[PDB]
Amino acid sequence: GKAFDDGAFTGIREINLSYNKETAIGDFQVVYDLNGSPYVGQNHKSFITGFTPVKISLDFPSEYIMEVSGYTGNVSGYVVVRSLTFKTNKKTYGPYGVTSGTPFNLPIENGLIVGFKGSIGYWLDYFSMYLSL
Amino acid sequence: GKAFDDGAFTGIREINLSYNKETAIGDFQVVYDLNGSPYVGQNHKSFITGFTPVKISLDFPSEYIMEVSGYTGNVSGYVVVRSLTFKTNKKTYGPYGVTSGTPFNLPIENGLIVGFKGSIGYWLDYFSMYLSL
Amino acid sequence: QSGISQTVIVGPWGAK
Amino acid sequence: QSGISQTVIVGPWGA
Ligand SMILES: CO[C@@H]1O[C@H](CO)[C@H](O)[C@H](O[C@@H]2O[C@H](CO)[C@H](O)[C@H](O)[C@H]2O)[C@H]1O
Secondary structure: OEEEEOOOOOEEEEEEEEEOOOOOEEEEEEEEEEOOEEEEOOOEOOOOOOOEEEEEEOOOOOOOEEEEEEEEEEEOOEEEEEEEEEEEOOOEEEEEOOOOOEEEEEEEEEOEEEEEEEEEOOOEEEEEEEEEO | OEEEEOOOOOEEEEEEEEEOOOOOEEEEEEEEEEOOEEEEOOOEOOOOOOOEEEEEEOOOOOOOEEEEEEEEEEEOOEEEEEEEEEEEOOOEEEEEEOOOOEEEEEEEEEOEEEEEEEEEOOOEEEEEEEEEO | OOOOOOOEEEEEEEOO | OOOOOOOEEEEEEOO
């Protein structure tokens, strides 16, 4: 897959992703907050197409992500993130994509996701998160 | 369980925990660094005995934890931390306990675990970790 | 704010 | 040091 790294920003305003329930999470793009103004992140796109796009539009600044969880599993020989769920103080968005395989979750007791990095080939291979106060 | 919250420190020097190879994690205790001095954190003790103690003595400050992982699951009907594994830049300590149930993992690409909080009754019920640069 | 300094905390894992 | 600010990073998940 093609590695990406957004670096760190002030907060998150919108998450844009795509998935296919038969396979895994496909594209990923975040609209960040940068010093109280929207910053449109790079769109990190799969090698292939056919996915279902979703827009998660957060009521920033009062709504923020409290937990990112998911499943990883093998799709056509590739171990990829097959499912994502984003839980905010206001609501849960997801699961998007097939909820079978090995679960992961990052719950946050204090602090803010402020950036994403990872890798996307045919599917989202993996991702990490920047956290700040 | 009985709640505990050590708070945040400069680093970790040593983890003293106990486990049963048939059940879950019991006692948990941490010697932190506090600005260059060992800080003996309070021994957080299971309400029950029968555990096998483990002393994870890190080569602070050159050695530091890069991933904490484990399993949560039912024991006697309670969800508890059944297993913990501490991987550092030098070597892997664990798994300790029973490697069964829902897996979890917090890998750290950048930054440091500087504190623990949680709750222990018969077993370690749950926990969280303070992170810092 | 207060005079208490803050730190990122991730978790909890385990009983909810 | 360098002139680049740093930030805690957790991950990755997926493998
Ligand atoms: C038998 O004693 C129990 O030990 C358990 C496993 O360590 C729990 O600590 C239990 O305390 C109960 O824990 C549950 C969590 O699933 C919940 O907090 C409940 O409110 C609490 O009494 C303890 O009695």
